[PDB]
Design a protein around this ligand. Sequence first.
Ligand SMILES: [Mg+2]
Ligand SMILES: [Mg+2]
Ligand SMILES: [Mg+2]
Ligand SMILES: [Mg+2]
Ligand SMILES: [Mg+2]
Ligand SMILES: [Mg+2]
Ligand SMILES: [Mg+2]
Ligand SMILES: [Mg+2]
Ligand SMILES: [Mg+2]
Ligand SMILES: [Mg+2]
Ligand SMILES: [Mg+2]
Ligand SMILES: [Mg+2]
Ligand SMILES: [Mg+2]
Ligand SMILES: [Mg+2]
Ligand SMILES: [Mg+2]
Ligand SMILES: [Mg+2]
Lengths: 78, 66, 140, 97, 95, 58, 166
Amino acid sequence: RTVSFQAKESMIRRLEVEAENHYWLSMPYMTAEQECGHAAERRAQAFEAIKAAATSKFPKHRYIADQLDHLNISKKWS
Amino acid sequence: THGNRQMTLIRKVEGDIWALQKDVEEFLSPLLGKTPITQVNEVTGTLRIKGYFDEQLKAWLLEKGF
Amino acid sequence: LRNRLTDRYWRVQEVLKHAQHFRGRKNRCYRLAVRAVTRAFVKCTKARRLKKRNLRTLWINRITAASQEHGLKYPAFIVNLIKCQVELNRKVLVDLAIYEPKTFKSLAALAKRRQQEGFAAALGDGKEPEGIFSRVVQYH
Amino acid sequence: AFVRLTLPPPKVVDRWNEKRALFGVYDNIGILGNFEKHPKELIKGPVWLRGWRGNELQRCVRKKKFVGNRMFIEDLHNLNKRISYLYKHFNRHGKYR
Amino acid sequence: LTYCSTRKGKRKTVKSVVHRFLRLHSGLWLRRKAGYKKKLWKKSTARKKRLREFVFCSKTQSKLLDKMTTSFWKRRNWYAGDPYQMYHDRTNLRV
Amino acid sequence: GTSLDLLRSLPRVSLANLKPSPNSRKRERRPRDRRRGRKCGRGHKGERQRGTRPRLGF
Amino acid sequence: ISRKWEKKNKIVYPPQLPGEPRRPAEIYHCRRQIKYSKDKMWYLAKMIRGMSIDQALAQLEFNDKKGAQIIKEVLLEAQDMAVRDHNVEFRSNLHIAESTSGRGQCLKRIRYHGRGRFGIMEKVYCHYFVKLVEGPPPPPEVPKTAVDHAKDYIQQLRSRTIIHTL
RNA sequence: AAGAAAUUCGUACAUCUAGGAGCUAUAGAACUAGUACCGCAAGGGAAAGAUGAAAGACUAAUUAAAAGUAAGAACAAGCAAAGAUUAAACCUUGUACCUUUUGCAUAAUGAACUAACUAGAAAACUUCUAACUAAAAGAAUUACAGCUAGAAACCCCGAAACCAAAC
RNA sequence: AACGAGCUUGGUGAUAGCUGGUUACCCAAAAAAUGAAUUUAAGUUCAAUUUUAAACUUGCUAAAAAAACAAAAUCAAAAA
Ligand SMILES: [Mg+2]
Ligand SMILES: [Mg+2]
Ligand SMILES: [Mg+2]
Ligand SMILES: [Mg+2]
Ligand SMILES: [Mg+2]
Ligand SMILES: [Mg+2]
Ligand SMILES: [Mg+2]
Ligand SMILES: [Mg+2]
Ligand SMILES: [Mg+2]
Ligand SMILES: [Mg+2]
Ligand SMILES: [Mg+2]
Ligand SMILES: [Mg+2]
Ligand SMILES: [Mg+2]
Ligand SMILES: [Mg+2]
Ligand SMILES: [Mg+2]
Ligand SMILES: [Mg+2]
């Protein structure tokens, strides 16, 4: 086969973008040690929400109003 | 039920079932550390609570003199 | 025969009413009409999307005809109008060419001039004043 | 399909004839009558299924016990053949084991 | 097995189960070890000790054995001097 | 209590107004429709689809 | 079975007003059970379409098919009743508006073959229908002239519109 | 796979000469009939009818209503349609259906068309809804919150054979 | 009229791990077709997977060193 002109250019443009991706990933703002523990409080709160939802399942209330409202099916003009 | 879900039931209630729910929540809340999960059945006049609290409720009801 | 279906007449008519304009036994025989109607409905659904693409090709074809009357190729005409901050779409451009010949000619000159300004800016290098029509209004 | 070309004659139902008016009376004969009679004794039907219920195999075997000796030859031959067919279905066939 | 019997219309117990296992009222089943009387002369002293024990059954085996017996074999029995009196119940089980 | 007061307002109770307790009856499913028809839940051709798998314990 | 062709002769219109064209008369006639195939009878019924009564009877008299004789007798009875019962003045003043054949009730029999086999035989029957309308036969068809063809073509070009646009 | 008895219980509708959340001409009996017809014989075994108060009123009407035809053959180009269009056809888009195969068919089974008929059934355990509760059940059963009742489930057609008694 | 063993009725809805078929709509989830035993390989049972419900608490990606290996699979601190 012969690679078409379009295919060669399209690949080059994608190569150039990835080159810039390499550059912007080379300058970390914080070192590893500084990072440790900086977000502990937020993470712990999140699981507490998850656990609370899991252990909250229970049946629903039942009301006299629902059962007795069925009688209105026979309402009329007297 | 299901082999792992434990509950306690108060059965022959007359009058305002909702008032009883509020009292039970206040009475049991300090022990658990949270508000108890409950179900109110208006048609059958019963109250259902998650977890075993039969002994405490029996003593509690005697104090009120029912 | 305790219970028997008493509604088969109307269930049959639902299919056959959609087949009256067919040719052959397809318009009166249920076992044949039912197969043809579902094929028609599948075609109807797929042609809703294809319709929109077909009309765009028609617009581009007519625009190329209108521009070439003034000596412009389609890519040059469309691109340069954008660089002048003109946001007319292809559907409305076709209307002007057919129904507003003088207005379309005015737009033809505008696109051509902006193209010439770009050519001059490219060949000339260094700091030079920008073209009159090559100035971009800004928003904030 | 072909449908009627005329409306069928009307049906008129009397809702206050004697059978309909007094339906249910004496269904509480036991609780209101000191329990001398059970409500099941008020039922009318075949001798072998008064106050009793079962599946088809059980019904066939129960019928034979009650009136098997007072049956006609050909009727009894068919009843016995039905029992064996139902026996093999309920004990050897099915999705669930 | 027989799901519906001709004479009574009931399920029937498989008697080969009743002759090999014991059921505790909680739901456990007990059995012996296969081979606990065979060729003892060629078995080590530790191997022979393991064979003498009474052993429990798994969940799937317990399920199958329940289907093959009727309810009569699952009731409460009050035998004076029972040597299994203390094993019919469970204690401190969270599950 | 207050519940019996509601009855006074509502229409007469009759044989045309009855209703069961909610969720007391499940739905029974027949194999007519596409979801529950066709192979009808029995699988592909074999001993089990035809209905003659061996006995319990085999 | 349906017999509607017979009843068509009993329609009665209200009297015509003085300022109106004279309404021509109409006669409907048929013969019902005939031992002849309807496919074969079609060719005979087709031929006499549009012709006058005398021209139709002339062509029928020299056809060799069995169906030709049966059609002729039905035509003669229709002419007789037209004058006798439907107030037609002149016998010759009639033309055939409609003529067609229809299926009848048939019979099934056995047809033998050569190895103990058989087949199903049908003894076929048919109907014949006609309508007679008073007046000379309507004029025949004239093919389109070259000028007429062209005039249609310009009409087609003039109908064009600009499609799929404002 | 088969399966008792000892021992307990029971006068039952009792003129109910009556009843039907049983079928209505492809259903319900095979049945208008064990006839016609088929077989030497034992034996096998069908199909269908329709006016009105009066026919001593000429046999009644009612229905664009099935497939099939007629009224009215055809007109460059193609799974026969869809987007459309002033315009029926011309332009554009589009490898019949079910089953089975490796999630794939221009593979291979099955179908001339219309009408009617023609195939998932049980309650040991579980879940849901109620009654009463250290007890539940209208006798015999289960119980260290249980027990009683309701609801919830597991197809159709098709061999070569084997045995008994007739012809 | 069809004999490697006649024909008819009955046992009989014989049996078939094999062939064909199995009738309304909508929403949701979902496979691999690896391991073991079987007169078993045109079939079945158990593990493993999937799934509905319920109880309550840590999971997935990542993972330093320091091992065990011989000179990328285990293992899983602290963090994010
Ligand atoms: Mg596009
Ligand atoms: Mg079912
Ligand atoms: Mg023929
Ligand atoms: Mg006895
Ligand atoms: Mg019949
Ligand atoms: Mg019959
Ligand atoms: Mg027709
Ligand atoms: Mg074409
Ligand atoms: Mg082949
Ligand atoms: Mg074929
Ligand atoms: Mg049909
Ligand atoms: Mg079979
Ligand atoms: Mg694998
Ligand atoms: Mg072996
Ligand atoms: Mg196999
Ligand atoms: Mg960690």
